[PDB]
Design a protein that fits this description.
4-stranded antiparallel beta sheet, binds a molecule of 5 linked components (SGN-IDS-SGN-IDS-SGN), Trefoil (Acidic Fibroblast Growth Factor, subunit A), 130 residues, mainly beta, acetylation
Amino acid sequence: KKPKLLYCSNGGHFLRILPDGTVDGTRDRSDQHIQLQLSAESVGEVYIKSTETGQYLAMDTDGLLYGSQTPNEECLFLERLEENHYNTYISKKHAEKNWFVGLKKNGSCKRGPRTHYGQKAILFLPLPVS
Ligand SMILES: O=C(O)[C@@H]1O[C@@H](O[C@H]2[C@H](O)[C@@H](NS(=O)(=O)O)[C@@H](O)O[C@@H]2COS(=O)(=O)O)[C@H](OS(=O)(=O)O)[C@@H](O)[C@@H]1O[C@H]1O[C@H](COS(=O)(=O)O)[C@@H](O[C@@H]2O[C@@H](C(=O)O)[C@@H](O[C@H]3O[C@H](COS(=O)(=O)O)[C@@H](O)[C@H](O)[C@H]3NS(=O)(=O)O)[C@H](O)[C@H]2OS(=O)(=O)O)[C@H](O)[C@H]1NS(=O)(=O)O
């Protein structure tokens, strides 16, 4: 683990955690909020925390992504592999509902309830920085 970038195939954007707790995607590589440090809390779970603001990516009960200043149960995600070798992150809390981390092709975050196994918006690829 060294800070990475979560580049999403669908749309080709980099996961971003704006200082205001807003999660989205951007194509600007020079954006100072796309560097993320992934912290493994166990064998299949991970923490996705911003290096620039320190916020942890989390997902509320409504399936919306946000930047939390605290590592709570809503910040833990299961990292899995698609058969095309892409990383997909499903909310450990909302695991049974099948809610993943995902970005609309236009760049916006896709709502938990609006994502599902197999989509292209949930296909993330861990790109290395420096
Ligand atoms: O079409 C895309 O732009 C694209 O679709 C997926 O990409 C596929 C490629 O196009 C495909 N190539 S091919 O040549 O077209 O075959 C192939 O390469 O595969 C890729 C990836 O898909 S695959 O690998 O899973 O097969 C891809 O989908 S996703 O990754 O799963 O999200 C996306 O990259 C992208 O999809 C995006 O746009 C479509 C089309 O939108 S449009 O351009 O605005 O028209 C979005 O889908 C449309 O809208 C949704 C929706 O809004 O929810 C669906 O609409 C129905 O359901 C809603 C919600 O209902 S419910 O939840 O309340 O029950 C209703 O409000 C709508 O009225 C419903 N319409 S109905 O079904 O006709 O009754 C529906 O999927 C679709 O509607 S429509 O037909 O366009 O009207 C899609 O969400 C969006 N994904 S996002 O990640 O960008 O957000």
